Every structure is written in structure tokens, then in C-alpha cells.
């Protein structure tokens, strides 16, 4: 206490004391501490007695933090632990990850699960990714400009149950449609060639089909052949309903019942 100025009553067990190992006598690391206490780490601090020294557990030449378990600054010893453990149906999902690598973990999810992730700009941005269709995903780049408040970021449970859960419930109904098709995710080249082949078997009855677009997620596609010319009408799925010709339908069925008595105009 008169020369080194550090007694055992200051250093306690449980608190982390940074022990700088500068050398080793014969398997240990005997160095000095911050208060001049000669920190001699035993072989139990490195976990090796007949092998090389604790180079992975104690930094040779530098200071290595360890949990203080012995107060012997007057005895020329320092029981500093070299180990880091000695110092101490619509499922939600959480993250922090890369867009490419994120694509591989949302293919194992089935319809309905929503992952939360950051976004490529790497700060402030975040994105709500959900199962628009088989092989099609939405990436709501919230500031897809979905303007929100600042208070909601502390509770991440309502932005899904108010904007995406009803959206997914609305999107699932079209998947269970009687006339749904993949067409390679709505390839614009594959869709025009199907309507011209289905019209020839039954020229009187004109069928209709729905598809999602991989080229622009959240666009559904509704093609109909009033005559010998393919025609494509787009529709956006909204958190509150559907955006069809700028008219908002509360329920999934009123869209179809509005279409059955609107597609018979000459346009």
C-alpha cells in the first residue's frame, strides 16, 4: 500500500479487472495490472498446463479483460479469468440481415408468416416482408411509402396487425380462387398466349383468370378477352381493401360483384 498503492480491499471478486499479461514464467501469463499489481494468471485461467500458453485467452503484450476472482496485488498474483463467461398461423419473426440472404429464409416459411428486417441503405430504413404469393414477396419500404408516426417504433406489434394481417387475409382469398394460375409468376408473355388458347374451345363463354405479377409485387393481374385482342387490367391490394379503378371495396367479394356488371361496356 505504500509502494504499489493498491491493496486487496479495492479489488473485489466478481468485478472485471483488466489484467495485462506481458510474460509467462514457465505455462502461465505473469504480467502487471493497471494499478501496478503483478498479475500472475494461473494455468486454470488459460486452461492449459502441458500445451502452449494462454495466447487465445490472455493477450500477450496487451491488456486482456477478465473477471476479478482474487485480490493479491501485494502477493504478485492476479486471478483474472481469461474466459468471457467468467466475467459475467401468421407467426411473428425478428431479425437484422442481407436482402439476398434473407430470400433463402422466407422460402421455408409458408403463407402468412411475416419477417421483419432492415433495408439496404443500412440505417433508419426498415421493411415488412410478407408472402404476397408463391415466389412473390412484398417489401414494404416504410419511411411502398407507408407514412407512420415516431411513437409506434417502440411497439412493433400493431403495424402488422393493422396494415399487413388484413392485407394478407385479402390476398389469401385470391389464392383460393377457382381460376388461379401461376404462368411463371405472371409472365406477360405467358398470359397473352393462354387467353387465345382458352377462347377457341368455347367462343361463346369467355373465361377469366387472376394472377400476381413478379415484375411489380402487389400488382394482381386480371385479363379478359371481350374480343380477339388481349387486354390487361391491373389492381393493387391495399391494407384497407382493393384499388380497382380508384374504387375501394371493403370486402373481397364486392370487387368481383362490381366487376361482373362493369366489364360489359364497350370501353
Amino acid at each position: 500500500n505504500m509502494l504499489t498503492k493498491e491493496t486487496p480491499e479495492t479489488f473485489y471478486i466478481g468485478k472485471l479487472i483488466i489484467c495485462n499479461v506481458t510474460g509467462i514464467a514457465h505455462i502461465g501469463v505473469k504480467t502487471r495490472l493497471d494499478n501496478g499489481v503483478t498479475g500472475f494468471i494461473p494455468t486454470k485461467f488459460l486452461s492449459d498446463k502441458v500445451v502452449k500458453r494462454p495466447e487465445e485467452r490472455v493477450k500477450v503484450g496487451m491488456t486482456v479483460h477478465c473477471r476479478i476472482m482474487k485480490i493479491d496485488i501485494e502477493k504478485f498474483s492476479a486471478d483474472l479469468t481469461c474466459r468471457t463467461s467468467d466475467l459475467m398461423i401468421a407467426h411473428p419473426s425478428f431479425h437484422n440481415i442481407n436482402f439476398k440472404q434473407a430470400e433463402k429464409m422466407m422460402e421455408t416459411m409458408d403463407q402468412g408468416d411475416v419477417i421483419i428486417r432492415p433495408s439496404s441503405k443500412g440505417e433508419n430504413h426498415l421493411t415488412v416482408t410478407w408472402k404476397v404469393s408463391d415466389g412473390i414477396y412484398q417489401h414494404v419500404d416504410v419511411r411502398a411509402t407507408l407514412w407512420i408516426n415516431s411513437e409506434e417504433f417502440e411497439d412493433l406489434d400493431e403495424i402488422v396487425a393493422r396494415y399487413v394481417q388484413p392485407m394478407a387475409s385479402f390476398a389469401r382469398d385470391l389464392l383460393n380462387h377457382k381460376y388461379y394460375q401461376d404462368c411463371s409468376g405472371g409472365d406477360r408473355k405467358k398470359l397473352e398466349e393462354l387467353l387465345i388458347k382458352t377462347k377457341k374451345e368455347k367462343p361463346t363463354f369467355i373465361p377469366y383468370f387472376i394472377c400476381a405479377c413478379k415484375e411489380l409485387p402487389g400488382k394482381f393481374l386480371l385479363g379478359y378477352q371481350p374480343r380477339g385482342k388481349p387486354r390487361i387490367e391491373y389492381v393493387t391490394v391495399t391494407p384497407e381493401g382493393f384499388r380497382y379503378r380508384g374504387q375501394i371495396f371493403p370486402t373481397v367479394n364486392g370487387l368481383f360483384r362490381w366487376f361482373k356488371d362493369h366489364y360489359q361496356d364497350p370501353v
Binding site: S150, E151, F153, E154
Partner: protein
């Protein structure tokens, strides 16, 4: 040159509106309410804290209606706006006290009318 003793003030503040203790108390508390909600925010400065805890000691009353009441009962008379707050915070118990503290009240009004304005302020005090 400027001297509140003779109601002479800089034009930029003569055009400015004086505030009561309980008034600024309510405004500051409202701010603090907004300034401690809306997460991801910066704490108020110590200036705001010391101004709050100052005026909190000298709140004669609190509800906006009490402020509006004392303001309306004062403005109906012919007092200058500078007299509005010094006379509304202190609440001198007698007209003689108000006229001794405020030299502008001396001869400004009959003692019984100034005393009535005081007594009204006293009755507004919680």
C-alpha cells in the same frame, strides 16, 4: 433608460404580450408533456426545469379558466398590459400595498376600485 417603474419599455417588447405565473406554468407543463412523450426525443434543458420549478412555487391558480378570468377582469379596466402580470402574480392583499409596490397605481385609480380588483384576484386564488 428603460424602466418598468414608469411603464417605458423597448418597442419590441411593448408590442409583446406579458404572461402570468399560472399561465406560463401551464404552457411549460404542456410543453414538458409533449417533450417527455414522442419517443426518440431530446430532454428539456435545465432552463426549462428551473423555470418550471420556479413558477410552480408561485402558481396562484392553475386551470386556464382562472388565468382567463383574471385577465378578463383586468382588461375590462383601463390598466396597462404591464400592470396585468405584476398585479396578477403578487395579489397584494390591500390597495395600499399595491400602490406602495407599484408606483404607477398611485393616483391611477380610486383606492376602493383598486382594492376591488385586488379582492377579486384574492377570490380567484386557490
Amino acid at each position: 433608460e428603460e424602466d418598468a417603474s414608469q411603464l417605458i419599455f423597448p418597442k419590441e417588447f411593448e408590442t409583446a404580450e406579458t404572461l402570468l405565473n399560472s399561465e406560463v406554468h401551464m404552457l411549460l407543463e404542456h410543453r414538458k408533456q409533449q417533450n417527455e412523450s414522442a419517443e426518440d426525443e431530446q430532454e428539456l434543458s435545465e432552463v426549462f426545469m428551473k423555470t418550471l420549478n420556479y413558477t410552480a412555487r408561485f402558481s396562484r391558480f392553475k386551470n386556464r379558466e382562472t388565468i382567463a378570468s383574471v385577465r378578463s377582469l383586468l382588461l375590462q379596466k383601463k390598466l396597462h398590459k404591464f400592470e396585468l402580470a405584476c398585479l396578477a402574480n403578487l395579489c397584494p392583499e390591500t390597495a395600499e400595498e399595491s400602490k406602495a409596490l407599484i408606483p404607477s397605481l398611485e393616483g391611477r385609480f380610486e383606492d376602493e376600485e383598486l382594492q376591488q380588483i385586488l379582492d377579486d384576484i384574492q377570490t380567484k386564488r386557490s
